[PDB]
Amino acid sequence: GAMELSMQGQLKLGCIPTIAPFLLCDLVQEINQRFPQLNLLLREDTTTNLLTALRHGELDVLILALPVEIDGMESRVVGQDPFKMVISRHQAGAIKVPIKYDDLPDESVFLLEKGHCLTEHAVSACKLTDKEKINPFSATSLHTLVQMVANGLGTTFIPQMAIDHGLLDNQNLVVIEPPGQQAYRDIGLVWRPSSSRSKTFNQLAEVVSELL
Amino acid sequence: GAMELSMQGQLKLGCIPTIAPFLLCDLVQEINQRFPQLNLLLREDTTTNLLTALRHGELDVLILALPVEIDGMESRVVGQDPFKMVISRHQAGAIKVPIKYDDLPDESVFLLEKGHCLTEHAVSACKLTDKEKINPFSATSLHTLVQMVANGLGTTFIPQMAIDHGLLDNQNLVVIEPPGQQAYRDIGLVWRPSSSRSKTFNQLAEVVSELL
Numbered sequence: 001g002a003m004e005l006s007m008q009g010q011l012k013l014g015c016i017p018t019i020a021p022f023l024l025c026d027l028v029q030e031i032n033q034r035f036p037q038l039n040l041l042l043r044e045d046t047t048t049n050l051l052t053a054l055r056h057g058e059l060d061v062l063i064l065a066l067p068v069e070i071d072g073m074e075s076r077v078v079g080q081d082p083f084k085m086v087i088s089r090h091q092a093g094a095i096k097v098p099i100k101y102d103d104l105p106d107e108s109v110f111l112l113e114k115g116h117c118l119t120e121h122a123v124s125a126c127k128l129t130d131k132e133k134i135n136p137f138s139a140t141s142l143h144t145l146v147q148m149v150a151n152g153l154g155t156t157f158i159p160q161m162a163i164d165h166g167l168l169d170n171q172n173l174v175v176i177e178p179p180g181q182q183a184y185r186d187i188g189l190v191w192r193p194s195s196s197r198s199k200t201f202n203q204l205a206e207v208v209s210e211l212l
Numbered sequence: 213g214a215m216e217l218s219m220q221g222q223l224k225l226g227c228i229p230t231i232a233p234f235l236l237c238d239l240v241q242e243i244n245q246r247f248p249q250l251n252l253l254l255r256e257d258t259t260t261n262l263l264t265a266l267r268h269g270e271l272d273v274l275i276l277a278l279p280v281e282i283d284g285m286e287s288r289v290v291g292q293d294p295f296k297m298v299i300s301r302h303q304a305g306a307i308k309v310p311i312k313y314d315d316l317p318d319e320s321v322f323l324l325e326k327g328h329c330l331t332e333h334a335v336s337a338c339k340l341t342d343k344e345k346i347n348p349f350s351a352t353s354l355h356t357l358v359q360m361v362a363n364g365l366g367t368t369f370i371p372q373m374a375i376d377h378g379l380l381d382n383q384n385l386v387v388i389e390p391p392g393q394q395a396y397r398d399i400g401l402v403w404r405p406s407s408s409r410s411k412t413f414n415q416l417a418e419v420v421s422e423l424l
Contacts, residue, residue, distance in 0.1 A: 021355040025383055028363045032302065032384075040363050044353035090244065141256035143233040151240045151252050166378060171237055172244075 006199040007035040014043040014050040014059040018118045018142050019081075019187065022161040023063065026211045034207065047117050054192065061201050063208065065117050066186040074193045076205045079212025080184040082160040083122050085176045088152045092174045095155065099176055106132045108154040110145055113138035118185075122157035125183035146171065159185065161212075187212055218411040219247040226255040226262040226271040230330045230354050231293075231399065234373040235275065238423045246419065259329050266404065273413050275420065277329050278398040286405045288417045291424025292396040294372040295334050297388045300364045304386045307367065311388055318344045320366040322357055325350035330397075334369035337395035358383065371397065373424075399424055 015024055024042065031038050043050070043059055047068050053059045054073065064070075066077060087095050096103060111119045111134055122128075135154055139145035142162065149156050150171040157178060158167070168175070189205045191198070227236055236254065243250050255262070255271055259280050265271045266285065276282075278289060299307050308315060323331045323346055334340075347366055351357035354374065361368050362383040369390060370379070380387070401417045403410070 015356070017353070020353060020359075024356065024359050025362070028359050029383065032300075032363060039365055040360065041349050041365075042351070042356035042360050044356045088244075137253050139254070141229070141232060144227070144236065144254035144256045147232075147236050147240050148252065148254050150237070151244060153251055153253075166381070169378070171241065 006197070007203055008037040010039045010041060011061065011197075011200065012041045012043065012059045013061050013063065014045060014053060015063040016047055016050065016065060016117065017044055018116065018159060019063055019065060019161065020044045022159075022165040022167075023187070023208070023211060025165065027208060030207055030211065046115060048115070054190065057192070060191065060195065060197060061204065062190040064188055064190050065121055066188045068117055070190055072193070073190050074198075075188050075190045076202070077186045077188040078205050078209040079187050081187055081212065082182060082184045083126055083157050083178055084160060084163060085155050085178050086146065086149050086158055086168065086173045087155045087176065088150055089172045089174055091152050097176055099179055101128055101130055101133055101179065104133050104155070107135040109133045110135045110137070110139055110148055110154050110156045112142070112145060113140060118142065118157070118159065121185040122183075125180070125185060126157055126178040127180040127183075143167070146173070149173065218409070219415055220249040222251045222253060223273065223409075223412065224253045224255065224271045225273050225275065226257060226265060227275040228259055228262065228277060228329065229256055230328065230371060231275055231277060231373065232256045234371075234377040234379075235399070235420070235423060237377065239420060242419055242423065258327060260327070266402065269404070272403065272407065272409060273416065274402040276400055276402050277333055278400045280329055282402055284405070285402050286410075287400050287402045288414070289398045289400040290417050290421040291399050293399055293424065294394060294396045295338055295369050295390055296372060296375060297367050297390050298358065298361050298370055298380065298385045299367045299388065300362055301384045301386055303364050309388055311367075311391055313340055313342055313345055313391065316345050316367070319347040321345045322347045322349070322351055322360055322366050322368045324354070324357060325352060330354065330369070330371065333397040334395075337392070337397060338369055338390040339392040339395075355379070358385070361385065
């Protein structure tokens, strides 16, 4: 017979669509090795829906792009994800580098529809202020946005973690620096102040920081 | 001075989340070469929302997984997309091959939540009838579903076009045949009977058929 005898157990983690396909692959491989008893149940949803789930205790922690509206939550920025622009190789000549927005054709910049935070982050970080350059047809996923660019229709902003995870492979695209600073978005973990699992979230924040 | 002088112009195409990231990359590369004056504006959305947009004339044509409810629309099946199962390399020993569902642990099969048609197609084509094998935590995107499998939590069904497009790369997964037939989903194009662009859609159907 036999005697009866923070990074263990189950965690419910939410993440936005322009982060989840990319960073979470790396996170799972790391925690498999470093925290083998941590089971990560995963939710992908919009920033607004993730925040509602977090408030309602349906998720333990979020990985978000910041800044977004998170009043009352606790957050920790863990790294920076640069922005690039992309154009098709076949349109590379019709668009001059360095990019100057005023020299682009009207309606040549495609963007995700409002409610994708990639759009608010990229437009502000990359200082696109001339709305006449934005195509009126809004994209509804990062993959189909990039495919329209690959079809030669214009240009857009993409996060570095997508490039590093092969999103552009076999689509004959060229990667270009956007105007302004070296522009980027913050990545952060977000959780409830009343949670009893802050020790877990801070350990997870350290792991995520090393992936950026 | 100078005298004034079907696959040309603009097309609005909708596609479901478990097809769009994969097949549409191939489609754009092909049409760039073969139909260089065809501009493809792209929409990614749920089957139900795509059908509403199609009915309302907000999209010209859909690429769907079939069968789904498309009363009153015109459709053309263009190919078959096999299903596979996946498990993590680290759980490969705890799950025996050939897979028999009755030998899997209870709650070991993760599935996308209802409203993702991948679930209805895979469960029926791969003949999973024991609901006790399904984990109660529903996935909300194919990427995060696969990441939970990569974390060692269980198994799931994935479409071949995702495997062929690198979805499993660097996640240390093993690909296994599901039970039943060589199980698969149909892929098809769907449009309005009253459309004036049937010649375009049938040419597009031929191109898509060659990609499957």
